[PDB]
């Protein structure tokens, strides 16, 4: 249950928080990147697809599977205006 999210960075950013990463497990056993908060009115909220508990697979060209929090944050912030997110939905 992989879905694609194409978004446009608003002024306040992409409008979501992440947790997770190798050395920073969000779920015991899981090194994956996870969305923990969708900020009201932000890019992500207005698009409506992204959801808390979503796992980030890729952002643009940068795969996010088995990486450090800080690598994920860096890649998520190295983004232009146009953002492609590849996500997996829970369970």
């Amino acid at each position: 249950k992989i879905m694609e999210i194409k978004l446009i960075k608003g002024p306040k950013g992409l409008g979501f928080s992440i947790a997770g990463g190798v050395g920073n497990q969000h779920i015991p056993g899981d090194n994956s990147i996870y969305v923990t908060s969708i900020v009201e009115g932000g890019a992500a909220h207005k698009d409506g697809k992204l959801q808390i508990g979503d796992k980030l697979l890729a952002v643009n060209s940068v795969g996010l599977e088995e990486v450090t929090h800080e690598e994920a944050v860096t890649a998520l912030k190295n983004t232009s205006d146009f953002v492609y997110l590849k996500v997996a939905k829970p369970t």
Binding site: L14, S17, I18, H69
Partner: peptide, 4 residues
């Protein structure tokens, strides 16, 4: 929990 990074906000971006």
């Amino acid at each position: 929990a990074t906000g971006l």
